[PDB]
Amino acid sequence: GTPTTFVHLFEWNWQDVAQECEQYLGPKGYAAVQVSPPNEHITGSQWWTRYQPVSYELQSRGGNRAQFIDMVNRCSAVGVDIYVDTLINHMAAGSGTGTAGNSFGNKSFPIYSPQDFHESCTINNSDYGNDRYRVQNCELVGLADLDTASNYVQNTIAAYINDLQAIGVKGFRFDASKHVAASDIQSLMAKVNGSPVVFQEVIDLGGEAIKSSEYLSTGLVTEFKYGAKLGTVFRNGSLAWLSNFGEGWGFMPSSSAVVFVDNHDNQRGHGSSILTFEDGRLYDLANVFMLAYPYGYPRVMSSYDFHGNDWAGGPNVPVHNNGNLECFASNWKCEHRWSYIAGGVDFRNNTADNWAVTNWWDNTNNQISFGRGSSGHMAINKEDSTLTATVQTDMASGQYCNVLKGELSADAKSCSGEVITVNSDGTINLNIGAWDAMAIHKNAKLL
Ligand SMILES: [Ca+2]
Ligand SMILES: [Cl-]
Ligand SMILES: [Cl-]
C-alpha cells in the first residue's frame, strides 16, 4: 500500500506521539501526524494557549527540543512523517510569560518589536463579509497581528520553518491563513527551502470576502465544506446523494483539499451539524465513507473527552501510562485506533492506484456501496434493517478480509475477522447488520 491519510494527535506530548508511531501508526499505515504547536507559547493549561506564540524556541507543552527531535526520528523510522502546526499570523495577546521562560508584553517579544506588527485594531464580525483589509490586518481576538508583508517577519517565520525542516519535519499547517494575504504567504514560501507539504487553514463555506480558492496556488487548503456537508447528510439526508461528492458539491479541486469529519475547533461547537466522537457509530460510518471515497487528503481527528469544558486542556494522564493504554473511555478517545477508522485507512492505502468511484449502488436512501475499480469495494448500511442486496464489483473472485473488522494474517491464509466472498461473476451477496459496514481490497485477499 501507499500513504494516504494523516492524523491530528491533538495535545499529545512528544513521548506519547513517538510511542504511538512505533506501536500503532507505523504498523497501521498512517502517513503523518499533525502535532500541536511545538514553539514557545503562553503558560496555562487550556488547549488554546498553543495558539498564542511567545517565540520560536521548541519548548512547549509537548516537550523540549531534544524530545521533539526524538519524536521526529522515532516516527520517521517507522515511516510516519511529522507536520507542524505553524502560527504564521500572530503572536500572543497582552503580556505574560512563555513555556521557555521568556517574557512578553506591549507587542514586545524575544524576536519581535512593536514595529513588526500591524497597527492595532479589532476584527469585528461584520468584517468577514465586507472588509478583507481588516480581516487580514486587524487583531483576531486580541492576538498581536504580525506584519506578514515585512521582510524581517517573513525571514523570521521562514527561519522557524526551515529549522524544523532541517530536523526532519516534512509538512506544515499554516494556522489562521485567512488572516494573512495569500500574497504574503507567497512571499514567505519563496524563503522556505524545498517543497514540504503545506496546508492552509481557511474556513470558507461561502458568502464572505476572502475565499479559500485564493490559497490554492500556495499549498493545500482545508476544505471545511466537506465535513459540514457530510455531517448534514449523515444526520438528516440520504447517503445516496453522496454519489458525486466533491467538486460537484462546490468543493475545491480534490488535489488541493485537506478533508476531515471534524477538527479541534469545530468539535467544540466553535456547525451543530459536525460529527464527532460523541456521535459514536455515526462517526465511525462517516469516517469509513470519507476514507473510502476518492476526494482530498483526509486527516483523522484524535480527541480527548473534555467533559463539557470546551476550553480545557487534555487529560493529566499520558496515553501510554505505565503499560495501560488510556484510550476509548473518558480520557483520550484515540479515534485513529477505532477499528472502522483504522480499517478505512488501510482501505485508502490499498486503493490509491484507482481514484475512481465505480459501480455505485444505493437504495435511494441510507444504504450505499461502491468500488475503487478492481482495487477495492465497500458498503455502508446506515439503516435499521439488514442490508442483503447483491452488488456488482470489479474485484477478482475469491475471499477477502473485511478490513473494518480484521486483518489478513502474515501468511495470507486467514483473516482475524469477517471474511467477504466475491462471487464468480464479481458480485457480493451483502449481509450487513444495521449501522454496520464492510470494506475489502486487493491486498487483503486470502491466497
Ligand atoms: Ca493578519
Ligand atoms: Cl529551540
Ligand atoms: Cl484545520
Residue numbers in the entry: 0 to 269, 272 to 448
The authors write:
The α-amylase from the psychrophilic bacterium Pseudoalteromonas haloplanktis (AHA) is probably the most thoroughly studied cold-adapted enzyme that shows such an anomalous T-optimum, which, in this case, is about 15°C lower than the melting temperature (Tm). Earlier computer simulations of the catalytic reactions of AHA and PPA, based on molecular dynamics (MD) free energy calculations using the empirical valence bond (EVB) method, could directly reproduce the T-optimum of AHA and explain its origin. It was found that a particular binding interaction, between Asp264 of the enzyme and the 2′- and 3′-hydroxyl groups at the −1 position of the oligosaccharide substrate, starts to break precisely at room temperature. Since only the cold-adapted AHA enzyme showed instability of the Asp264-substrate interaction above room temperature, we hypothesized that if its β7-α7 loop conformation could be brought to that found in PPA, then its T-optimum could possibly be raised. In particular, the final model (Chimera 4) that combines 16 mutations in all of the four identified regions above is predicted to almost entirely recover the stable hydrogen bond interaction between Asp264 and the substrate at 25°C, as opposed to the wild-type (WT) enzyme.
To structurally evaluate our computational design, we determined the crystal structures of Chimera 4 in its apo form and in complex with the inhibitor acarbose. The electron density is weak for the two residues Ala271 and Gly272 of the remodeled β7-α7 loop, in both the apo- and holo-structures, so that their backbone conformation cannot be confidently built. There is, however, clear indication from the partial density that the loop conformation is closer to that of PPA than AHA, as intended for Chimera 4. For example, both PPA and Chimera 4 have a well-defined water position that bridges between the carbonyl oxygens of Asn265 and Gly273, and this water molecule would clash with the AHA backbone. Chimera 4, on the other hand, turns out to have a notably larger upshift of the optimum of about 6°C and now shows an activity maximum at around 45°C with this substrate, which is close to that predicted computationally. However, although Chimera 4 has lost a factor of 6 in activity at 25°C, it is now the fastest variant at 50°C, where it is three times faster than AHA and 1.4 times faster than PPA.
